[PDB]
Structures are given as structure tokens and as C-alpha cells.
Design a protein around this ligand. Structure first.
Ligand SMILES: CN1CCCc2ccc(S(N)(=O)=O)cc21
Ligand SMILES: [Zn+2]
Length: 140
């Protein structure tokens, strides 16, 4: 579990979005496993605006933050998970690291702020859904 809290927006894995998220929907994309909902209080997170490929991510199944190198976002064949079929996911970044299903929502951060959230796992990789192309998270 985990979210990004930027302005009056809550960014979560689409597959973990709650009824309240869907009832207060701003934007969602199944291809990228992302959903954004509205918030009452303003959030503490800043979104990175950058092409960094190094950062740190939180791994709940280890209670640890790990430094990683990651790819720029791509269309990656993701093997079957407990929450998704074997399928293609867009705007996905991969790193070598530990990821189990419950690690979804962990933040990846660079020197510029929040890059994305854990979205995929298995076979010694962790995948992150990128948010840095969502400039509209910074305004309105
Ligand atoms: C929209 N466009 C161009 C700019 C950045 C970017 C990154 C990933 C993907 S993709 N192939 O995962 O849909 C598409 C894309
Ligand atoms: Zn950066």
C-alpha cells in the first residue's frame, strides 16, 4: 500500500484504489496502473520533474529504503501477479530489487522529489509507475 499526496491529489495504484477514490476520481489509466482522486487537506509530496535514472524506493516487505538505478518509462510485458494477469503495462520503470504485491504504493524518489510508486514485482525486479510526465499534478 501507499500513495503520493501532491496538492489536493491522491495518487494510488489503480488496483488498490478504494470506493472513495473512485467516488472522488480525477483521472485513471489501467495501462499504467494509476488512479488519482481528490483530497480535502493539501499533501506533503513534491513531484520530480526530470529524467533521473537513480533514486531510492521504499520496500514495505523489508521495512527498508533501497538505492536503485532504474530504466526510463517503457511498455514492459509484466508476468502474472496476484492482482493482474500477465499483461503489457505502460510508463513503467524497472530496477533490480525486491517487490512483492503488498509493496505496491512504495515511493521511488530522486533528488528532484517523487518519481513514481511501486507497481510490479517478481524475478528479482521491482517496477515503478512513473508520475513525472503528469505536470497537471503541480497545478489547479
Ligand atoms: C507518451 N510517451 C512519450 C513520452 C514518454 C513515454 C514513456 C512511456 C510510454 S509507453 N511506451 O510505456 O506507453 C510512452 C511515452
Ligand atoms: Zn530527478
Amino acid at each position: 500500500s501507499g500513495a503520493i499526496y501532491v496538492g489536493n491529489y491522491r495518487v494510488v495504484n489503480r488496483h488498490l484504489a478504494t470506493h472513495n477514490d473512485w467516488a472522488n476520481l480525477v483521472w485513471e489509466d489501467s495501462s499504467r496502473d494509476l488512479l488519482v482522486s481528490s483530497t480535502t487537506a493539501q499533501g506533503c509530496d513534491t513531484i520530480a520533474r526530470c529524467d533521473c535514472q537513480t533514486g531510492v524506493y521504499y520496500c514495505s516487505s523489508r521495512r527498508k529504503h533501497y538505492p536503485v538505478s532504474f530504466s526510463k518509462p517503457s511498455l514492459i510485458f509484466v508476468e502474472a501477479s496476484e492482482y493482474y494477469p500477465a499483461r503489457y503495462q505502460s510508463h513503467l520503470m524497472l530496477a533490480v530489487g525486491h517487490s512483492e504485491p503488498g509493496d505496491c504504493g512504495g515511493i521511488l524518489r530522486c533528488q528532484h522529489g517523487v518519481v513514481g510508486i511501486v507497481s510490479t514485482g517478481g524475478n528479482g525486479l521491482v517496477g515503478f509507475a512513473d508520475v513525472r510526465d503528469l505536470l497537471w499534478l503541480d497545478e489547479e
